[PDB]
Design a protein around this nucleic acid. Sequence first.
RNA 1: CCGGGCACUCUAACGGGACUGCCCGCGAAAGCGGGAGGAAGGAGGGGACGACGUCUGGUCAGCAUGGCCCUUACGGCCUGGGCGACACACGUGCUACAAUGCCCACUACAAAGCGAUGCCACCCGGCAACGGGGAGCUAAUCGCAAAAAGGUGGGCCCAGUUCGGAUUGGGGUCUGCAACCCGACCCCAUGAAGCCGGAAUCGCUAGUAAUCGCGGAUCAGCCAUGCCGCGGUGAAUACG
RNA 2: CGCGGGGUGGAGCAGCCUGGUAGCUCGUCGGGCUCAUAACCCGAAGGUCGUCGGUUCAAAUCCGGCCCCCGCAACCA
RNA 3: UUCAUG
Lengths: 78, 120, 144, 206, 60, 155, 24
Amino acid sequence: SLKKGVFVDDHLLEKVLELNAKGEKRLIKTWSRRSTIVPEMVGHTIAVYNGKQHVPVYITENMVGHKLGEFAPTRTYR
Amino acid sequence: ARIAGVEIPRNKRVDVALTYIYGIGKARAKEALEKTGINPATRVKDLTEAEVVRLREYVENTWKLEGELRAEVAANIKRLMDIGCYRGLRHRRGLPVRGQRTRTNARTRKGPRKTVAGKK
Amino acid sequence: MAPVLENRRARHDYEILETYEAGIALKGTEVKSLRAGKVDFTGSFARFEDGELYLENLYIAPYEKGSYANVDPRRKRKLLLHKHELRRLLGKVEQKGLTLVPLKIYFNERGYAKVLLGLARGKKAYEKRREDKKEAVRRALEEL
Amino acid sequence: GNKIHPIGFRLGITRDWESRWYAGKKQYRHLLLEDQRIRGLLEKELYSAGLARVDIERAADNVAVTVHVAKPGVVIGRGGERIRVLREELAKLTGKNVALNVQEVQNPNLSAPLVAQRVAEQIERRFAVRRAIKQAVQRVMESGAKGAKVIVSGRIGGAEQARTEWAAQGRVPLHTLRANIDYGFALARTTYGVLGVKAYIFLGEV
Amino acid sequence: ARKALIEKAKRTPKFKVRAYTRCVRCGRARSVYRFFGLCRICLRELAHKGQLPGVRKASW
Amino acid sequence: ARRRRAEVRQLQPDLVYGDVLVTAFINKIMRDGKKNLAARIFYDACKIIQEKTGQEPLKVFKQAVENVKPRMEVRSRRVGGANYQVPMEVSPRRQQSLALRWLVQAANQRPERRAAVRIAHELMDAAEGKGGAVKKKEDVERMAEANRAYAHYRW
Amino acid sequence: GKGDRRTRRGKIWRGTYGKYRPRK
RNA sequence: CCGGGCACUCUAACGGGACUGCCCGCGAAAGCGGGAGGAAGGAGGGGACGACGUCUGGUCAGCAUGGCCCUUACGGCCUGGGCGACACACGUGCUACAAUGCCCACUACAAAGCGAUGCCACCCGGCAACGGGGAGCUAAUCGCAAAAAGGUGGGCCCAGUUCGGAUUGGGGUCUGCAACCCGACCCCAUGAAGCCGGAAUCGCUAGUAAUCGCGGAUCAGCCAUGCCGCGGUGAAUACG
RNA sequence: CGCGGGGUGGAGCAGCCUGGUAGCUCGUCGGGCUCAUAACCCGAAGGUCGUCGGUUCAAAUCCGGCCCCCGCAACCA
RNA sequence: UUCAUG
Ligand SMILES: [Mg+2]
Ligand SMILES: [Mg+2]
Ligand SMILES: [Mg+2]
Ligand SMILES: [Mg+2]
Ligand SMILES: [Mg+2]
Ligand SMILES: [Mg+2]
Ligand SMILES: [Mg+2]
Ligand SMILES: [Mg+2]
Ligand SMILES: [Mg+2]
Ligand SMILES: [Mg+2]
Ligand SMILES: [Mg+2]
Ligand SMILES: [Mg+2]
Ligand SMILES: [Mg+2]
Ligand SMILES: [Mg+2]
Ligand SMILES: [Mg+2]
Ligand SMILES: [Mg+2]
Ligand SMILES: [Mg+2]
Ligand SMILES: [Mg+2]
Ligand SMILES: [Mg+2]
Ligand SMILES: [Mg+2]
Ligand SMILES: [Mg+2]
Ligand SMILES: [Mg+2]
Ligand SMILES: [Mg+2]
Ligand SMILES: [Mg+2]
Ligand SMILES: [Mg+2]
Ligand SMILES: [Mg+2]
Ligand SMILES: [Mg+2]
Ligand SMILES: [Mg+2]
Ligand SMILES: [Mg+2]
Ligand SMILES: [Mg+2]
Ligand SMILES: [Mg+2]
Ligand SMILES: [Mg+2]
Ligand SMILES: [Mg+2]
Ligand SMILES: [Mg+2]
Ligand SMILES: [Mg+2]
Ligand SMILES: [Mg+2]
Ligand SMILES: [Mg+2]
Ligand SMILES: [Zn+2]
């Protein structure tokens, strides 16, 4: 789906581009799970929000063309 | 005559006989028989061996199949079970993934109903 | 060692919406009597006092090996829940008009006693009797 | 789960629509909003005059808001000024030419929307309930009608059990389409609850 | 929560997907009609009173 | 029905034969409102009849219906203790229905695989006397007439 | 049958159009 | 499609027509059995219609409402999640388990509908969903729209199969700020369970059952196989 | 204190044959029936076969021997 | 004609 957009957020995109300034810190607390893993902007562990708390997914190159909400699983009993 | 892997059909029409090769279904078997150029309704008990290899040169060289495909499907599954994407988890415990309800259904991703349940 | 007990009148009185396997912190000796069956819940539920649940007004016999080490028998014992469950029920008391009654005191594989709490609504089965003749006719004489 | 509404059972025949106008999908919701809001103004604030129905029409920007009142002495005014202020009120919620035609009833007891309101005023005035019912049916028959039935629903007489009392004199043929049984309904909002007065008035048949 | 929501149906300065229509007389958010704008209950009690022109008990 | 006599739906006469047995056979063949396929099946069946046997397209079928037509059929009646299975003789206005329904069931269970040749090989063997439908007739006329012991309940 | 998404009747049951059920 | 034009089918008003009306048999009368004519029969077939009241039936979560309770929160706003979770059980349906069946092509045959920020004809592009132009429609006038089942003649050949289409991977298009929880479709792989079903049980007495599609509602999309309607083909039986 | 006899599904029991092939009733779980529980009907499932060591290719089966349970004796003085 | 109870 979704071939006419980069579908990244006006605050997650700004934060990862500002935190890619020559290498920076690691904390980025997002609430918007809908945004994708910013392609070629991987590396910084993002604290996604399944509702109960912020799970700190360390994003890797095997997870680049996915969304951030896959890594905040919203239920128990896997 | 075997085609790909070892998957040999006999005594059947060729344009569904190709379907027994994994990775070829009904649509690819419709397409890449007249695409090479074969009457797609010749029973493979009588298939000319020159036409068998003129078919096989399109079967193996074009798209990936049983083994090199099957293994990439399984590697996609193992890649999905990575740290915990939501589709690689629930492959990790076999539940369904693309929006299936599981309250009552999902007997083809679960089992054999383990009927250990029930109140008093 | 005791089997499942019974809150007889509460099982046959209050509508059990849902249950919890709660816990009881026994304050030192009231154990073997509850392990032998001495418990009567009549006139008791589990009441909060602004932070936590106490199983109120439960009579258990002081055990007769403690010749003078007895306990005040009908007291408020410190019940056990989880914390989000505890503040959940603390909210739900004022949200829905509940009463929190036990159902049984049953033991687990740790050899511990757990008081199976359950919610109430009342289950209003009490028949408000239809009016007899000698009041309906004087209401009608008022209506004259 | 019974007895469908004897206005809407008749409604196609023997009985007019109380609001009759027209437009398609574009302005039907938008007309109905102001047609409900005009009535929410009137029925809340003209009840002292005892309005029965609000026949609302519009041919093209001529909102005939012709109401049916028993006593227009507090819906017109002495020489007419409450009618004037009420028309400038009806201009405030719809800008159109809101011609408000008050029209009196030919007998204020053959109109079920006012008999039921009168019973509701008796209940909210704390009168005796079945005395009010058997009086209202008798006042309807002395006004002269073929048959009446005033169902007054529960919490009756300040009780706790809620029975429904009713009384009839004459015939009330509900299932007959040609009957022209007028129907009125009015809440009563006293202390012990909501007393729902209904009243059926069997006028001339056919 | 319905006096909030019968005005939340009015106000939209945010996205235009959240313009769910709410009922006019009552405040029901289900079965509200893209015609009249009443819900099915307000539609039934207005069609039976006769405050909707043209509407009628159907039998075909 | 319980009150009245419940008179039977008058059928149509058929087109090519002008007969009333054949239309009830069309109806008993007819699966899920598909009469234009069912009577198609029957006319292919009489074509296979005219191919195989030098007979009429209708005569082998009518004689098959007659030679599958039951007379004594067993009906259950609970008469206290053990529900007896009482024999009774059948009105021909029910014999026709039982006969045609047995023909369709035995023809559909008959081990040929195509539509009208199943009915062809069934009507041939039923007009002969060695078919599954006449086997079922003899089955029910051996249930009754050997279950004759409780026939004194005529009901 | 009809739950299939790649035939004629399987597409007319789902209602939509495709390679298997085209637009004229 | 018009040039001539409305004959008709139709449309939707207004009317008529069917009432034991006729005649016979039975019958105290009501009425019943039959016949004739009629298009129709003995409530012509269906709707709407549901009495006094019961179940202290259901709904304070459609609304209105007495009472009690919350009033820097049990109110209010938002972001995100959930309402979709799953060891199993149940109810209602859908497709199936095939050759009367399935697949491709081609040609027919409906009513009911619904649409100015909508329906989108007809092109171009893309296998396709759809995308870019844009005709017509303020709609018996243009559109959705294809009707499907049927029929035609080509395939399959009793095979878990060209039955089945669940599942899973991949490529995508639309809506929407947003499809990961959780949308719909498209395409290509995948091809499982399932070979007519236990004990039990349900539905149906005529255009009914069965089978087949179509429309609408709500609606951005949609969960739709549901619901509400529409027609196509169209039975068996009711001894009692 | 010494003989001999058992140990098998939640319980009560068949058993298991030189060892390889394990069940019966009730109970259980799910369904069906019923307004609902009974009863009845339908689908399965459940056991380290007293622990332990022994020869055996392999033990529940055969050989010991140890712990609980049963039946016996414990007499002459 | 079987068949126990709320
Ligand atoms: Mg899901
Ligand atoms: Mg006990
Ligand atoms: Mg009492
Ligand atoms: Mg009482
Ligand atoms: Mg007394
Ligand atoms: Mg007061
Ligand atoms: Mg919406
Ligand atoms: Mg017997
Ligand atoms: Mg017959
Ligand atoms: Mg298929
Ligand atoms: Mg065409
Ligand atoms: Mg009729
Ligand atoms: Mg109740
Ligand atoms: Mg209230
Ligand atoms: Mg509530
Ligand atoms: Mg309200
Ligand atoms: Mg709030
Ligand atoms: Mg839900
Ligand atoms: Mg089903
Ligand atoms: Mg098919
Ligand atoms: Mg529409
Ligand atoms: Mg375009
Ligand atoms: Mg139109
Ligand atoms: Mg039309
Ligand atoms: Mg797929
Ligand atoms: Mg079946
Ligand atoms: Mg049975
Ligand atoms: Mg539709
Ligand atoms: Mg739904
Ligand atoms: Mg066993
Ligand atoms: Mg034992
Ligand atoms: Mg059981
Ligand atoms: Mg001695
Ligand atoms: Mg018996
Ligand atoms: Mg008995
Ligand atoms: Mg008893
Ligand atoms: Mg009693
Ligand atoms: Zn409403």
